[PDB]
PDB file of C-alpha atoms in Angstrom:
ATOM      1  CA  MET A   1      -1.435 -40.019 -69.912  1.00 12.92           C
ATOM      2  CA  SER A   2      -2.658 -37.053 -67.836  1.00 12.77           C
ATOM      3  CA  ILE A   3      -1.788 -35.863 -64.347  1.00 12.34           C
ATOM      4  CA  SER A   4      -2.641 -38.289 -61.605  1.00 11.42           C
ATOM      5  CA  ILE A   5      -2.904 -37.309 -57.961  1.00 11.57           C
ATOM      6  CA  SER A   6      -2.859 -39.197 -54.658  1.00 15.33           C
ATOM      7  CA  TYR A   7      -4.096 -37.577 -51.441  1.00 15.46           C
ATOM      8  CA  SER A   8      -4.688 -38.650 -47.895  1.00 18.01           C
ATOM      9  CA  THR A   9      -8.415 -38.392 -46.932  1.00 16.81           C
ATOM     10  CA  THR A  10      -7.237 -35.719 -44.497  1.00 15.18           C
ATOM     11  CA  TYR A  11      -7.046 -33.301 -47.402  1.00 13.51           C
ATOM     12  CA  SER A  12     -10.360 -34.310 -49.050  1.00 15.89           C
ATOM     13  CA  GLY A  13     -11.884 -30.878 -48.607  1.00 19.84           C
ATOM     14  CA  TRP A  14      -8.634 -28.953 -48.960  1.00 20.25           C
ATOM     15  CA  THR A  15      -7.667 -27.121 -52.165  1.00 19.63           C
ATOM     16  CA  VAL A  16      -4.348 -27.959 -53.844  1.00 19.57           C
ATOM     17  CA  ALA A  17      -3.362 -24.302 -53.470  1.00 20.01           C
ATOM     18  CA  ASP A  18      -4.082 -24.236 -49.671  1.00 18.13           C
ATOM     19  CA  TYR A  19      -2.331 -27.570 -49.213  1.00 21.69           C
ATOM     20  CA  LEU A  20       0.856 -26.675 -51.121  1.00 21.78           C
ATOM     21  CA  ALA A  21       1.105 -23.272 -49.477  1.00 20.73           C
ATOM     22  CA  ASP A  22       0.832 -24.922 -46.063  1.00 20.51           C
ATOM     23  CA  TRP A  23       3.252 -27.775 -47.012  1.00 18.92           C
ATOM     24  CA  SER A  24       5.947 -25.509 -48.494  1.00 18.51           C
ATOM     25  CA  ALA A  25       6.026 -23.290 -45.385  1.00 18.12           C
ATOM     26  CA  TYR A  26       6.147 -26.454 -43.207  1.00 16.45           C
ATOM     27  CA  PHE A  27       9.057 -27.912 -45.259  1.00 15.61           C
ATOM     28  CA  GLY A  28      10.677 -24.492 -45.230  1.00 15.79           C
ATOM     29  CA  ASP A  29      13.941 -23.573 -46.905  1.00 13.54           C
ATOM     30  CA  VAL A  30      17.122 -25.756 -46.707  1.00 10.33           C
ATOM     31  CA  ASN A  31      19.284 -22.809 -47.864  1.00 12.27           C
ATOM     32  CA  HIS A  32      20.836 -24.594 -50.784  1.00 13.21           C
ATOM     33  CA  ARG A  33      22.675 -21.635 -52.280  1.00 11.13           C
ATOM     34  CA  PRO A  34      26.094 -20.414 -53.185  1.00 13.84           C
ATOM     35  CA  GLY A  35      28.372 -20.639 -50.156  1.00 16.64           C
ATOM     36  CA  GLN A  36      25.723 -22.459 -48.112  1.00 18.78           C
ATOM     37  CA  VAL A  37      26.214 -26.038 -49.356  1.00 17.59           C
ATOM     38  CA  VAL A  38      29.244 -26.774 -47.169  1.00 18.17           C
ATOM     39  CA  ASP A  39      28.470 -30.284 -45.988  1.00 16.06           C
ATOM     40  CA  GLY A  40      25.921 -33.100 -46.552  1.00 18.62           C
ATOM     41  CA  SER A  41      23.080 -31.635 -44.467  1.00 19.33           C
ATOM     42  CA  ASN A  42      21.255 -29.853 -47.315  1.00 20.26           C
ATOM     43  CA  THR A  43      22.437 -31.463 -50.594  1.00 21.56           C
ATOM     44  CA  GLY A  44      19.702 -33.968 -50.951  1.00 21.82           C
ATOM     45  CA  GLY A  45      20.707 -36.996 -52.999  1.00 23.41           C
ATOM     46  CA  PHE A  46      20.170 -38.872 -56.232  1.00 25.45           C
ATOM     47  CA  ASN A  47      19.293 -42.520 -56.841  1.00 25.21           C
ATOM     48  CA  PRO A  48      21.469 -44.010 -58.138  1.00 23.97           C
ATOM     49  CA  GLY A  49      23.605 -40.865 -58.260  1.00 23.08           C
ATOM     50  CA  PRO A  50      26.081 -39.447 -57.881  1.00 25.87           C
ATOM     51  CA  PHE A  51      24.499 -36.550 -59.908  1.00 24.56           C
ATOM     52  CA  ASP A  52      21.877 -38.300 -62.028  1.00 25.25           C
ATOM     53  CA  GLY A  53      19.010 -40.609 -61.316  1.00 22.53           C
ATOM     54  CA  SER A  54      15.446 -41.709 -61.369  1.00 20.92           C
ATOM     55  CA  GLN A  55      14.953 -39.959 -57.960  1.00 17.83           C
ATOM     56  CA  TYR A  56      16.121 -36.871 -56.226  1.00 17.09           C
ATOM     57  CA  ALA A  57      15.158 -36.607 -52.575  1.00 15.15           C
ATOM     58  CA  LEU A  58      15.557 -34.085 -49.879  1.00 16.81           C
ATOM     59  CA  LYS A  59      14.582 -33.759 -46.223  1.00 15.86           C
ATOM     60  CA  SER A  60      13.582 -30.510 -44.440  1.00 13.54           C
ATOM     61  CA  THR A  61      16.101 -28.872 -42.069  1.00 11.08           C
ATOM     62  CA  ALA A  62      13.811 -28.516 -39.017  1.00  8.89           C
ATOM     63  CA  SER A  63      10.803 -30.754 -39.700  1.00  6.93           C
ATOM     64  CA  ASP A  64      10.260 -34.376 -40.703  1.00 11.38           C
ATOM     65  CA  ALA A  65       9.019 -33.147 -44.064  1.00 11.40           C
ATOM     66  CA  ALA A  66      10.565 -34.447 -47.270  1.00 11.21           C
ATOM     67  CA  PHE A  67       9.958 -34.802 -50.959  1.00 12.11           C
ATOM     68  CA  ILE A  68      10.936 -37.203 -53.684  1.00 13.92           C
ATOM     69  CA  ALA A  69      11.181 -36.011 -57.272  1.00 13.63           C
ATOM     70  CA  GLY A  70      10.935 -38.867 -59.736  1.00 13.47           C
ATOM     71  CA  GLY A  71      11.800 -38.993 -63.421  1.00 11.97           C
ATOM     72  CA  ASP A  72      14.952 -39.092 -65.543  1.00 12.15           C
ATOM     73  CA  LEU A  73      16.927 -36.397 -63.787  1.00 15.34           C
ATOM     74  CA  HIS A  74      20.361 -34.884 -64.220  1.00 12.99           C
ATOM     75  CA  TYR A  75      22.345 -32.324 -62.260  1.00 11.41           C
ATOM     76  CA  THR A  76      25.240 -30.333 -63.679  1.00 12.05           C
ATOM     77  CA  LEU A  77      26.976 -29.579 -60.355  1.00 10.15           C
ATOM     78  CA  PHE A  78      29.956 -27.339 -61.271  1.00  9.25           C
ATOM     79  CA  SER A  79      29.761 -27.883 -65.044  1.00  6.41           C
ATOM     80  CA  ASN A  80      28.168 -25.210 -67.303  1.00  9.31           C
ATOM     81  CA  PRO A  81      25.421 -24.306 -66.798  1.00  4.29           C
ATOM     82  CA  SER A  82      26.271 -24.763 -63.140  1.00  4.08           C
ATOM     83  CA  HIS A  83      23.812 -26.173 -60.638  1.00  4.87           C
ATOM     84  CA  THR A  84      21.063 -27.005 -63.017  1.00  2.26           C
ATOM     85  CA  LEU A  85      18.612 -29.793 -62.427  1.00  3.58           C
ATOM     86  CA  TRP A  86      17.367 -30.874 -65.838  1.00  4.47           C
ATOM     87  CA  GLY A  87      15.787 -33.807 -67.631  1.00  4.48           C
ATOM     88  CA  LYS A  88      12.370 -35.366 -67.240  1.00  3.92           C
ATOM     89  CA  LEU A  89      10.256 -34.767 -64.151  1.00  4.42           C
ATOM     90  CA  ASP A  90       7.333 -37.268 -63.869  1.00  6.35           C
ATOM     91  CA  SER A  91       6.490 -37.135 -60.175  1.00  3.04           C
ATOM     92  CA  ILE A  92       6.601 -35.139 -56.991  1.00  4.63           C
ATOM     93  CA  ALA A  93       5.753 -36.884 -53.757  1.00  3.75           C
ATOM     94  CA  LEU A  94       5.340 -34.916 -50.513  1.00  5.46           C
ATOM     95  CA  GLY A  95       5.219 -36.373 -47.052  1.00  8.95           C
ATOM     96  CA  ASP A  96       7.046 -37.156 -43.842  1.00 11.14           C
ATOM     97  CA  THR A  97      10.085 -39.234 -42.992  1.00  9.29           C
ATOM     98  CA  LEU A  98      12.438 -39.896 -45.878  1.00  9.09           C
ATOM     99  CA  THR A  99      14.263 -43.245 -45.873  1.00 11.59           C
ATOM    100  CA  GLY A 100      16.691 -45.105 -48.019  1.00 15.27           C
ATOM    101  CA  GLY A 101      18.926 -43.854 -50.758  1.00 16.82           C
ATOM    102  CA  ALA A 102      21.097 -45.176 -53.512  1.00 17.09           C
ATOM    103  CA  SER A 103      22.767 -47.698 -51.174  1.00 16.11           C
ATOM    104  CA  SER A 104      19.447 -49.402 -50.361  1.00 16.42           C
ATOM    105  CA  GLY A 105      18.017 -49.366 -53.864  1.00 15.11           C
ATOM    106  CA  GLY A 106      15.797 -46.258 -53.631  1.00 15.88           C
ATOM    107  CA  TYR A 107      14.326 -43.445 -51.580  1.00 16.36           C
ATOM    108  CA  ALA A 108      10.958 -43.774 -49.880  1.00 14.70           C
ATOM    109  CA  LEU A 109       8.634 -41.843 -47.646  1.00 18.10           C
ATOM    110  CA  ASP A 110       7.248 -43.542 -44.545  1.00 18.97           C
ATOM    111  CA  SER A 111       4.169 -41.289 -44.646  1.00 21.50           C
ATOM    112  CA  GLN A 112       3.194 -39.804 -47.972  1.00 17.79           C
ATOM    113  CA  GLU A 113       0.600 -36.973 -47.828  1.00 20.61           C
ATOM    114  CA  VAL A 114       0.136 -36.061 -51.471  1.00 21.93           C
ATOM    115  CA  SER A 115       1.709 -36.985 -54.796  1.00 18.96           C
ATOM    116  CA  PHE A 116       1.536 -35.609 -58.319  1.00 19.26           C
ATOM    117  CA  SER A 117       2.490 -37.913 -61.181  1.00 20.68           C
ATOM    118  CA  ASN A 118       2.506 -37.916 -64.991  1.00 20.10           C
ATOM    119  CA  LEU A 119       3.732 -34.352 -64.889  1.00 20.41           C
ATOM    120  CA  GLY A 120       5.385 -34.814 -68.288  1.00 18.56           C
ATOM    121  CA  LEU A 121       7.912 -32.039 -67.696  1.00 16.65           C
ATOM    122  CA  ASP A 122      11.101 -32.124 -69.735  1.00 16.68           C
ATOM    123  CA  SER A 123      13.769 -29.470 -69.710  1.00 17.59           C
ATOM    124  CA  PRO A 124      17.034 -29.545 -71.687  1.00 19.77           C
ATOM    125  CA  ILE A 125      20.392 -28.850 -70.170  1.00 20.46           C
ATOM    126  CA  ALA A 126      21.068 -25.717 -72.241  1.00 22.89           C
ATOM    127  CA  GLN A 127      18.088 -23.953 -70.593  1.00 20.83           C
ATOM    128  CA  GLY A 128      20.107 -23.961 -67.336  1.00 18.65           C
ATOM    129  CA  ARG A 129      18.354 -22.671 -64.221  1.00 15.88           C
ATOM    130  CA  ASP A 130      15.584 -21.158 -66.418  1.00 18.04           C
ATOM    131  CA  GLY A 131      14.354 -24.679 -67.096  1.00 18.84           C
ATOM    132  CA  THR A 132      10.904 -25.534 -65.737  1.00 20.92           C
ATOM    133  CA  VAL A 133      12.216 -28.749 -64.156  1.00 22.60           C
ATOM    134  CA  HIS A 134      14.877 -26.825 -62.261  1.00 24.45           C
ATOM    135  CA  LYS A 135      12.502 -24.108 -61.071  1.00 24.65           C
ATOM    136  CA  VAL A 136       9.837 -26.562 -59.942  1.00 24.88           C
ATOM    137  CA  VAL A 137      12.172 -28.638 -57.771  1.00 23.86           C
ATOM    138  CA  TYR A 138      14.489 -25.892 -56.589  1.00 25.05           C
ATOM    139  CA  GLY A 139      11.355 -24.014 -55.517  1.00 25.23           C
ATOM    140  CA  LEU A 140      10.422 -26.914 -53.220  1.00 25.69           C
ATOM    141  CA  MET A 141      13.944 -26.874 -51.770  1.00 23.76           C
ATOM    142  CA  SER A 142      13.702 -23.189 -50.955  1.00 22.38           C
ATOM    143  CA  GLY A 143      10.176 -23.018 -49.501  1.00 25.73           C
ATOM    144  CA  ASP A 144       8.331 -21.771 -52.591  1.00 24.11           C
ATOM    145  CA  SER A 145       5.861 -24.093 -54.303  1.00 20.92           C
ATOM    146  CA  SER A 146       4.848 -21.401 -56.915  1.00 20.72           C
ATOM    147  CA  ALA A 147       6.467 -23.026 -59.926  1.00 18.28           C
ATOM    148  CA  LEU A 148       5.034 -26.416 -59.030  1.00 18.99           C
ATOM    149  CA  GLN A 149       1.617 -24.855 -58.484  1.00 17.52           C
ATOM    150  CA  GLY A 150       1.724 -23.261 -61.945  1.00 17.06           C
ATOM    151  CA  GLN A 151       2.561 -26.474 -63.692  1.00 15.53           C
ATOM    152  CA  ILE A 152      -0.097 -28.406 -61.854  1.00 15.91           C
ATOM    153  CA  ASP A 153      -2.616 -25.632 -62.690  1.00 15.41           C
ATOM    154  CA  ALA A 154      -1.800 -25.969 -66.412  1.00 14.40           C
ATOM    155  CA  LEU A 155      -1.994 -29.749 -66.424  1.00 13.88           C
ATOM    156  CA  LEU A 156      -5.287 -29.650 -64.595  1.00 16.44           C
ATOM    157  CA  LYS A 157      -6.829 -27.160 -67.031  1.00 13.94           C
ATOM    158  CA  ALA A 158      -5.776 -29.312 -69.965  1.00 12.18           C
ATOM    159  CA  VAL A 159      -7.815 -32.196 -68.484  1.00 11.28           C
ATOM    160  CA  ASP A 160     -10.932 -30.181 -67.897  1.00 10.48           C
ATOM    161  CA  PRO A 161     -11.269 -26.421 -67.913  1.00 10.58           C
ATOM    162  CA  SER A 162     -13.335 -26.475 -64.659  1.00  7.96           C
ATOM    163  CA  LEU A 163     -10.240 -27.776 -62.809  1.00  6.99           C
ATOM    164  CA  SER A 164      -7.498 -25.702 -61.327  1.00  6.82           C
ATOM    165  CA  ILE A 165      -4.993 -25.372 -58.526  1.00  5.38           C
ATOM    166  CA  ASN A 166      -7.952 -24.001 -56.497  1.00  2.20           C
ATOM    167  CA  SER A 167     -10.054 -27.153 -56.872  1.00  2.00           C
ATOM    168  CA  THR A 168     -10.507 -29.433 -53.820  1.00  2.00           C
ATOM    169  CA  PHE A 169      -8.860 -32.826 -53.883  1.00  2.00           C
ATOM    170  CA  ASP A 170     -12.372 -34.326 -53.720  1.00  2.00           C
ATOM    171  CA  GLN A 171     -13.330 -32.384 -56.837  1.00  2.64           C
ATOM    172  CA  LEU A 172     -10.282 -33.716 -58.631  1.00  2.00           C
ATOM    173  CA  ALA A 173     -11.276 -37.184 -57.576  1.00  2.00           C
ATOM    174  CA  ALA A 174     -14.805 -36.604 -58.967  1.00  2.00           C
ATOM    175  CA  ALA A 175     -13.163 -35.455 -62.198  1.00  2.00           C
ATOM    176  CA  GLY A 176     -11.113 -38.692 -62.438  1.00  2.00           C
ATOM    177  CA  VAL A 177      -7.743 -36.989 -61.794  1.00  2.00           C
ATOM    178  CA  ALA A 178      -7.164 -37.808 -58.108  1.00  2.00           C
ATOM    179  CA  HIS A 179      -7.580 -40.696 -55.705  1.00  2.00           C
ATOM    180  CA  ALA A 180      -8.009 -40.657 -51.932  1.00  2.00           C
ATOM    181  CA  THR A 181      -6.061 -43.097 -49.774  1.00  2.00           C
ATOM    182  CA  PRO A 182      -8.382 -45.876 -48.596  1.00  2.00           C
ATOM    183  CA  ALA A 183      -6.379 -45.667 -45.324  1.00  2.00           C
ATOM    184  CA  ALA A 184      -7.071 -45.586 -42.561  1.00  2.00           C
TER     185      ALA A 184
END
């Protein structure tokens, strides 16, 4: 099935490009980089983990922002090719206030803003950090939603060539691809 999007009515008249640009700058950069992952503050986590799962989730350093990546995900840690997220990425959910974890049976957001699902991305381990899955999620970690934007743009075009990353959420809804929250 094709990409499916959830958005809060707040963003009805926003474009996906405007939204993701604003969100990524709001989430910022957790500085997850060589020599800068020295404790648990910026690792994120996997469910069930320790380095694989159906979710990877990460909270912003200085805001309440967070995302959950959903799929069939794997992380190489120190093993060649080192620090590669690979596997299947089905969903990215963006919002505020991450809760839970492996110990409680899953991650959740208290307040989801927007989600993209049925992304259908699938990168093999041997592609290392050049894998699309890696670049999409690592981009979110480091305050750059470019890779995610590109993949959403492609998926949208494949549905209907009038759709793009620059469409409004309401347009995507009209085109059958997105759905506004009934709330509040």
